[PDB]
Structures are given as structure tokens and as C-alpha cells.
Design an enzyme around this catalytic site. Structure first.
Site, PDB file in Angstrom:
ATOM      1  NE  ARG A 156      -1.249  -0.438   4.962  1.00 15.87           N
ATOM      2  CZ  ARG A 156      -0.855  -1.551   5.582  1.00 15.87           C
ATOM      3  NH1 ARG A 156      -0.719  -2.688   4.914  1.00 15.87           N
ATOM      4  NH2 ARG A 156      -0.658  -1.536   6.895  1.00 15.87           N
ATOM      5  CD  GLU A 197       1.308   1.976  11.093  1.00 12.45           C
ATOM      6  OE1 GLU A 197       2.406   2.374  11.513  1.00 12.45           O
ATOM      7  OE2 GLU A 197       0.321   2.733  10.985  1.00 12.45           O
TER       8      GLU A 197
HETATM    9  O1  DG2 Z   1      -1.734  -0.280  11.464  1.00 10.65           O
HETATM   10  C1  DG2 Z   1      -2.780   0.155  10.934  1.00 10.65           C
HETATM   11  O2  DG2 Z   1      -3.819  -0.504  10.711  1.00 10.65           O
HETATM   12  C2  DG2 Z   1      -2.794   1.631  10.531  1.00 10.65           C
HETATM   13  C3  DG2 Z   1      -2.845   2.502  11.788  1.00 10.65           C
HETATM   14  O3  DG2 Z   1      -3.997   2.198  12.580  1.00 10.65           O
HETATM   15  P1  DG2 Z   1      -4.257   2.982  13.962  1.00 10.65           P
HETATM   16  O4  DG2 Z   1      -2.872   2.961  14.782  1.00 10.65           O
HETATM   17  O5  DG2 Z   1      -4.524   4.513  13.545  1.00 10.65           O
HETATM   18  O6  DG2 Z   1      -5.379   2.402  14.732  1.00 10.65           O
HETATM   19  O7  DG2 Z   1      -1.611   1.943   9.790  1.00 10.65           O
HETATM   20  P2  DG2 Z   1      -1.671   2.319   8.225  1.00 10.65           P
HETATM   21  O8  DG2 Z   1      -1.020   1.076   7.437  1.00 10.65           O
HETATM   22  O9  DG2 Z   1      -3.222   2.345   7.797  1.00 10.65           O
HETATM   23  O10 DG2 Z   1      -0.985   3.594   7.904  1.00 10.65           O
END
Ligand code: DG2
Ligand code: DG2
Ligand code: HAI
Lengths: 255, 254
Positions: free
Chosen positions: B61, B88
């Protein structure tokens, strides 16, 4: 030991469909070309290909072809490197002109020499040419390993190999010798130049080699990095030969 | 400022819309996210950005977001480098769970703590988890600068910074110092981690920083690569603030 790699000509673009020499003009893939690229990805997925590195030209059609293939494979994380040394042969003043019109104006023989010969050089592109500015004013050519003023204004297939060979030997071949699985997403003539070298095709016989868009080219090399056998096209052979005939016919007069 | 760089959270993906913790699960962008990425590219083009290098995570992504941005800019030839160190934050066992459902079952405050705390480490993901196999059996994690068995099974934001900082120091920072214009396409929490470092945000204040998907963030750095001012979201502040509220509300019951 032996090594296998995949090379291919980018998916169809509007200029391919409209039969106009495009070369260094940065045309995008059209809908048909996007499909061709995705189909290549599907074939490679069927074969369980796991690429380690991808090499492309700096023309976006070769980059997008690679991106579509990687997406189909779920391998978008695989390193990509783009270089002008894999750019399609520079067609000089012929850029923008219709191939069939050139056949009518100059004859099929001359057009065949311009398109497929090894030593014939197209007339150089001049500043007055409709596509000169957009080519040489682009930032991608201000950061090449060769000064903007030194980049070619036209190239014979031999000229192409002369600037492509160093890139192959110095940056791609070492990876092949390391047993890495490589994808070379390029163009018709830059791919023909590399094939001529790896397969030891004579200056005369290379004129009969034509590559269609969006068809994976399989090539196996030996320990000395030379072709073990002729390159092969992956897919329906009848369809592939029909596409090759279509490319050849772009430079022929209607009968 | 002496230097300027752009960073952003990838465009909306299927799980952002479904409101499920995604983390290391390799979900793709959805139609809305593709549009967000393209609008990012259009906004950057309108501001004359000419990138020299792009850095992304190994989650598709973030890569696709970068590719769409480069296409809008006509800069597809710009070098791209990807690393798990920009991935992430690893949500561990929370991966796959619905944020709102968790707020309903445990309380909004509890969810807010798990999502934005700097120090709290989520419970590690185990082999019995529905998404364990597809994560650790993926080839991209067999070729990282650290053995597969050494990769995290869950991370606090602090953990994220500890594994992201080395990549910033070794690979990205040097390029910024050379004067190159860099684009960092990453994620919500990994981006928060880098912002905390660049802006010198306290362990307490970082909890209040929430980033919206697909919005370019401009960072102005000095000679020491320290932010000269707070990060700046490029675009209409009202709409961007609304997108931020949307992210915050993912953990609220309503
Ligand atoms: O880990 C995930 O699902 C999101 C953050 O979620 P939240 O920490 O805001 O709940 O990261 P993304 O890949 O969408 O940038
Ligand atoms: O230069 C061009 O226009 C074509 C080849 O044209 P022909 O030499 O086959 O006529 O290159 P490609 O479509 O692979 O980018
Ligand atoms: N005026 C044209 C003559 C043939 C080569 C390309 C230019």
C-alpha cells in the site's frame, strides 16, 4: 551452471497502435498495453517466478509494464532500477513519423534497414523537430551518467549496444552470476541489441529478429553468460507469430 | 529552512475502510485510496516538487501510493528504495480486530491508549493468529537486514522508532543533507515515530498526533536536520482536519 532471466518489450501504447515511431518520446501504455503487462505477470505467476531485481529504462512505458507485472506477482517490494541505457533506440528525425508512410515515401527496403539493420543510423533529430524540446528538456536526462549535451540525437542498433552493453556487464550480469532472478523490462530495439550480444547473432541475421509487445522472452545463459540456446517467447506461439507479423507489416505497403 | 522533505501516510486501503487494525498484513489500496494518492501527486505537482529519491515500506500500500504519486508528477523514473524499517507499527494480536468493536467491548479510552501510547506494547501475535502465517512466510521478510526469527511480533511506538531511526540515520538523512528532495511514503504510526524524532515531540505530546491517509506532509529541517517548525499538512486545513477526526473516530462508539 546455467542461469535464466526474463526480458520483454513494454505493453502496447497509442503510438504502437497508430504506427508512429516513438522512441525517446515518453508515451504511456494504453488500455491494451496495460492488459498485456498484466497478462505477462499472470504467466510469470503461473511459473512461480520470484524476482530479486528488476531493470527498466527511464521511459515510463517500461516502468509501468514492470509495476503491473510486480503487482500481479505480489512482488511490489522487489527492487527496481531504471536507466537511460535501456531506453529504446533513438530514432532521430524519424520520431513521430508513421512507419507505413515512410514505406510509401522511401520504399520497404529502406524502412527495413532503418528499423532492423545493425549499422544504419537514422537522420539525427534537430531542434526544429516537433518532439526535440520535450525530450531534451526533461529532468530525467539532466541526471544521467552522461551530460545532456552528450546524449545521442539518433542511434544505429550498434550505437544502442555500445551504450547498453556496459550497463549489462557492470550492473545486471553480476546479479545473474550470483544466481539472482532478473526481469528486464525494456523496448523492442534495446532488447534486440542485448539479444544480439548474448546469442552471438551476426550483424546480418539480427535484421530478421522482431519482438512483439507484452510477450515474455525466456533466455538461458551459461557460465560465460552467453546464450545456451535461442531466446523463446512465452505464450501461444500462433498468436505470438501473428503479433510478430503485425510488427513487420507496420513497415510494409498495403497489398 | 535549509532542507524540505515530504512524508505521508499511504492512501486508504480496504482495512482502513473496514476499520480493522491492519499493520503488517499486506492489504491493498482501494479505489478511494488510489484517488487520495493521485490527489497527493496533483498537489505536489502544483507546488513544483521534483523528487530525487523515494523511500517506502515493504507493504504494497505504501509502494502503490508512491507509484501513483510519481505517475501524476511524471517522475516514474525517480529511484525508489523500500525497507521493513518503514513498515507500520506491528499491532501483534490486535491485527484483524475491528477498532470500534474493541471500543465497545473495552472502552474508548482503552483503545485510544493502545492506538496512540508511546510506551505500551501490544500483545505479541502468536502462531494461532489468523494472519500469522501470511506475514512470516512471506519472502520479503526472508531478505531483511535481520533474520526472520528476529523480526518483531508486536511493537510499541517506541519500539518502532528504535528500528526506524537506524534507517533514517544510515540511508535517508545523508541524502537530505546532500540537498536531495525526498519523498517518504509510509504509514500512520511509523510516520508518527519519525515526526516525533524530527520535531523533538515529547513522549506525552506524541499521543495527540494523528495522521490522515493520503495527505502530503511538509517538513522543514535545518542544518542539523531538526524541524524548524511543526509539520505542515499540504492542502485545505478544514478538510484535512476532518480526515484526522475521521481517524480518531474509528475508535469511538457511534
Ligand atoms: O496499522 C494500521 O492498521 C494503521 C494505523 O492504525 P491505527 O494505529 O490509527 O489504529 O496503519 P496504516 O497502514 O493504515 O498507515
Ligand atoms: O522506437 C519505437 O517506436 C519502438 C520500436 O519501433 P520499431 O523499431 O519496431 O519500428 O520502440 P518500443 O515500442 O519498443 O518502445
Ligand atoms: N524528412 C524525413 C526524411 C527521411 C528520414 C526522416 C526525416
Amino acid at each position: 551452471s546455467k542461469y535464466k532471466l526474463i526480458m520483454l518489450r513494454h505493453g502496447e501504447g497509442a503510438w504502437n497502435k497508430e504506427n508512429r515511431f516513438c522512441s525517446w518520446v515518453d508515451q504511456k501504455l494504453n488500455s491494451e498495453g496495460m492488459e498485456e503487462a498484466r497478462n505477462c505477470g499472470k504467466q510469470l505467476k503461473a511459473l512461480n517466478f520470484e524476482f530479486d531485481l528488476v531493470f527498466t529504462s527511464v521511459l515510463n512505458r517500461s516502468i509501468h509494464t514492470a509495476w503491473l507485472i510486480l503487482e500481479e506477482l505480489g512482488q511490489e517490494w522487489v527492487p527496481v532500477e531504471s536507466s537511460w541505457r535501456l531506453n529504446e533506440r533513438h530514432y532521430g528525425a524519424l520520431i513521430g513519423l508513421n512507419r507505413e508512410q515512410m514505406a510509401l515515401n522511401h520504399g520497404e527496403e529502406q524502412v527495413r534497414l532503418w528499423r532492423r539493420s545493425y549499422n544504419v543510423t537514422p537522420p539525427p533529430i534537430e531542434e526544429s523537430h516537433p518532439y526535440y524540446q520535450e525530450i531534451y528538456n526533461d529532468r530525467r536526462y539532466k541526471v544521467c551518467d552522461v551530460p545532456l549535451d552528450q546524449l545521442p540525437r539518433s542511434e544505429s542498433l550498434k550505437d544502442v549496444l555500445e551504450r547498453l552493453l556496459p550497463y549489462w556487464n557492470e550492473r545486471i550480469a553480476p546479479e545473474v552470476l550470483r544466481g539472482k532472478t532478473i526481469l528486464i523490462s525494456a523496448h523492442g530495439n534495446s532488447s534486440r541489441a542485448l539479444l544480439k550480444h548474448l546469442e552471438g547473432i551476426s550483424d546480418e541475421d539480427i535484421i530478421n529478429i522482431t519482438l512483439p509487445t507484452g510477450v515474455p522472452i525466456l533466455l538461458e545463459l551459461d557460465e560465460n553468460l552467453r546464450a545456451v540456446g535461442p531466446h523463446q517467447f512465452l505464450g501461444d506461439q500462433e498468436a505470438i507469430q501473428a503479433a510478430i507479423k503485425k510488427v513487420e507489416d507496420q513497415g510494409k505497403v498495403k497489398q
